[PDB]
Design an enzyme around this catalytic site. Sequence first.
Site, mmCIF file in Angstrom:
data_model
loop_
_atom_site.group_PDB
_atom_site.id
_atom_site.type_symbol
_atom_site.label_atom_id
_atom_site.label_comp_id
_atom_site.label_asym_id
_atom_site.label_seq_id
_atom_site.Cartn_x
_atom_site.Cartn_y
_atom_site.Cartn_z
ATOM 1 C CD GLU A 78 -1.378 0.104 3.830
ATOM 2 O OE1 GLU A 78 -1.513 1.315 4.023
ATOM 3 O OE2 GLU A 78 -1.835 -0.913 4.190
HETATM 4 C C1 LIG Z 1 -3.722 -6.234 4.389
HETATM 5 C C2 LIG Z 1 -3.540 -4.725 4.854
HETATM 6 O O1 LIG Z 1 -2.949 -4.076 4.384
HETATM 7 N N1 LIG Z 1 -4.110 -4.691 6.201
HETATM 8 C C3 LIG Z 1 -4.133 -3.324 6.546
HETATM 9 C C4 LIG Z 1 -3.845 -3.314 8.011
HETATM 10 O O2 LIG Z 1 -2.180 -3.431 8.100
HETATM 11 C C5 LIG Z 1 -4.019 -2.310 9.160
HETATM 12 O O3 LIG Z 1 -4.076 -2.496 10.537
HETATM 13 C C6 LIG Z 1 -3.103 -2.282 10.851
HETATM 14 O O4 LIG Z 1 -1.874 -2.842 10.569
HETATM 15 C C7 LIG Z 1 -0.525 -2.683 11.205
HETATM 16 C C8 LIG Z 1 0.700 -3.158 10.699
HETATM 17 O O5 LIG Z 1 0.819 -3.017 9.255
HETATM 18 C C9 LIG Z 1 -0.907 -2.921 12.594
HETATM 19 O O6 LIG Z 1 0.400 -2.741 13.628
HETATM 20 C C10 LIG Z 1 0.782 -3.679 14.882
HETATM 21 O O7 LIG Z 1 0.041 -3.213 15.809
HETATM 22 C C11 LIG Z 1 0.330 -4.168 16.854
HETATM 23 C C12 LIG Z 1 -0.281 -3.722 18.033
HETATM 24 O O8 LIG Z 1 -0.012 -2.419 18.660
HETATM 25 C C13 LIG Z 1 1.851 -4.316 17.026
HETATM 26 O O9 LIG Z 1 2.013 -5.429 18.101
HETATM 27 C C14 LIG Z 1 2.839 -5.275 19.063
HETATM 28 O O10 LIG Z 1 4.249 -5.421 18.574
HETATM 29 C C15 LIG Z 1 5.212 -5.470 19.759
HETATM 30 C C16 LIG Z 1 6.572 -5.482 18.865
HETATM 31 O O11 LIG Z 1 6.588 -5.870 17.582
HETATM 32 C C17 LIG Z 1 5.061 -6.437 20.560
HETATM 33 O O12 LIG Z 1 5.937 -6.211 21.609
HETATM 34 C C18 LIG Z 1 3.740 -6.205 21.391
HETATM 35 O O13 LIG Z 1 3.515 -7.236 22.108
HETATM 36 C C19 LIG Z 1 2.642 -6.359 20.247
HETATM 37 N N2 LIG Z 1 1.330 -5.994 20.790
HETATM 38 C C20 LIG Z 1 0.327 -6.810 20.495
HETATM 39 C C21 LIG Z 1 -0.997 -6.406 21.287
HETATM 40 O O14 LIG Z 1 0.550 -8.072 19.923
HETATM 41 C C22 LIG Z 1 2.688 -4.674 15.965
HETATM 42 O O15 LIG Z 1 4.023 -4.549 16.146
HETATM 43 C C23 LIG Z 1 2.399 -3.807 14.728
HETATM 44 N N3 LIG Z 1 2.764 -4.211 13.593
HETATM 45 C C24 LIG Z 1 3.701 -3.569 12.899
HETATM 46 C C25 LIG Z 1 4.280 -3.967 11.541
HETATM 47 O O16 LIG Z 1 4.302 -2.339 13.265
HETATM 48 C C26 LIG Z 1 -1.821 -2.230 13.398
HETATM 49 O O17 LIG Z 1 -2.155 -2.641 14.813
HETATM 50 C C27 LIG Z 1 -3.425 -2.366 12.537
HETATM 51 N N4 LIG Z 1 -4.129 -1.626 12.986
HETATM 52 C C28 LIG Z 1 -5.461 -2.173 13.427
HETATM 53 C C29 LIG Z 1 -6.518 -1.163 13.740
HETATM 54 O O18 LIG Z 1 -5.553 -3.421 13.208
HETATM 55 C C30 LIG Z 1 -5.544 -1.779 8.773
HETATM 56 C C31 LIG Z 1 -5.855 -0.608 9.503
HETATM 57 O O19 LIG Z 1 -7.546 -0.519 9.593
HETATM 58 O O20 LIG Z 1 -5.943 -1.476 7.208
HETATM 59 C C32 LIG Z 1 -5.479 -2.560 6.453
HETATM 60 O O21 LIG Z 1 -5.761 -2.176 5.154
#
Ligand SMILES: CC(=O)N[C@@H]1[C@@H](O)[C@H](O[C@@H]2O[C@H](CO)[C@@H](O[C@@H]3O[C@H](CO)[C@@H](O[C@@H]4O[C@H](CO)[C@@H](O)[C@H](O)[C@H]4NC(C)=O)[C@H](O)[C@H]3NC(C)=O)[C@H](O)[C@H]2NC(C)=O)[C@@H](CO)O[C@H]1O
EC number: 3.2.1.14
Length: 273
Positions: free
Chosen positions: A127
Site C-alpha cells: 500500500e
Molecule cells: C492487508 C492490509 O494491508 N491490512 C491493513 C492493516 O495492516 C491495517 O491494520 C494495522 O496494521 C498494522 C501493521 O501494518 C498494525 O500494527 C501492529 O500493531 C500491533 C499492536 O500495537 C503491534 O504489536 C505489538 O508489537 C510489539 C513489537 O512487535 C510487541 O512487543 C507487542 O506485544 C505487540 N502487541 C500486541 C498486542 O500484540 C505490531 O508490532 C504492529 N505491526 C507493525 C508491523 O508495526 C496495526 O495494529 C493495525 N491496526 C488495526 C486497527 O488493526 C488496517 C487498519 O485499518 O488497514 C488494512 O488495510
Amino acid sequence: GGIAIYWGQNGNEGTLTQTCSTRKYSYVNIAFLNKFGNGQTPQINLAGHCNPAAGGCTIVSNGIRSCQIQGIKVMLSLGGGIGSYTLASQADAKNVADYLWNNFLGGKSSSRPLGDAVLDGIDFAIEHGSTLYWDDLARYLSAYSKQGKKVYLTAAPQCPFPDRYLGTALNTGLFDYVWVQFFNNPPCQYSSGNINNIINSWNRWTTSINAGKIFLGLPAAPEAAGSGYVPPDVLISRILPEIKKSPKYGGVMLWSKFYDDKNGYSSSILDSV
Ligand SMILES: CC(=O)N[C@@H]1[C@@H](O)[C@H](O[C@@H]2O[C@H](CO)[C@@H](O[C@@H]3O[C@H](CO)[C@@H](O[C@@H]4O[C@H](CO)[C@@H](O)[C@H](O)[C@H]4NC(C)=O)[C@H](O)[C@H]3NC(C)=O)[C@H](O)[C@H]2NC(C)=O)[C@@H](CO)O[C@H]1O
C-alpha cells in the site's frame, strides 16, 4: 463462497492452530513480512505472537500444517500498513523472490522464519513505497511453480480502481485470489444508508481484472479500521444478494482475526457467504 482471514498482528487473537480449528475460514494470510527490498534483511512481524529471532517463530509451522490438513490454504502476506518494504529494481524483485522461495516455499534454507512448513502462496498487501517491479515479483514467484508444487498468488488492493501499487501486477493475470479492501476509502466503501459506492466499485473490479476469484474485503469490527465497517445485517440482506450473482465471486475477506473474535462477525455471516 468462503472467508479469508488475516492473522498475526495481535498476540491476543489466538494461535494459528486455534484460528483454523474454528472451521470458519478457508484461507489464512499471515501478516506481515513488512521489511524487505533495497538490500535490507527481510524481517517478519507477528506482533506479540513470537519473536522471529533464534527461531522463536518456527513454532508457527505446527499451525500451518494443522490448517493445511484441513484443506485451508495459508499465504505469507507482504507489506501491510507499516513497514519499510519496497523493490529498488527488477534485480531486487528476483532477489526477494528467491528469498521467499527458500525461506517460505519449496526452497531450502537453514533459517526458515516460520519453520520447515511449506506455505501455499504469497499475498501482496502493498500500500506504499514503490509502485514498480511488483509485476516482476509475481512473475518470478510464479515461475517456481514449474518445479512441481504450485505457488498461489493473492493480492489485497485498495478498492479504488485501478490500484496504484498492484494495478500492473494484477494485469499479468497470474493472481488466483484477490480480496479487495472496501474500507479506509470513502469513494468505494459503505456509508450509512448507501451501498451504491461499494456495489459500483465491485462491478468495476469483477469486470476489469483476470483473476481466479474476487473477494469482498471488510473490517471485522468498527475498531478494525478508520471507516468502512458494514453491519452484519446490512451485508447479508443488501450487499451479498447482489455480489454473489457474479461468477467471479469468491467470498469475503476480513481484517482481522483479533477483531473478528471480539465482534463475532464471521460467526454471524458464515452461512450467507
Ligand atoms: C492487508 C492490509 O494491508 N491490512 C491493513 C492493516 O495492516 C491495517 O491494520 C494495522 O496494521 C498494522 C501493521 O501494518 C498494525 O500494527 C501492529 O500493531 C500491533 C499492536 O500495537 C503491534 O504489536 C505489538 O508489537 C510489539 C513489537 O512487535 C510487541 O512487543 C507487542 O506485544 C505487540 N502487541 C500486541 C498486542 O500484540 C505490531 O508490532 C504492529 N505491526 C507493525 C508491523 O508495526 C496495526 O495494529 C493495525 N491496526 C488495526 C486497527 O488493526 C488496517 C487498519 O485499518 O488497514 C488494512 O488495510
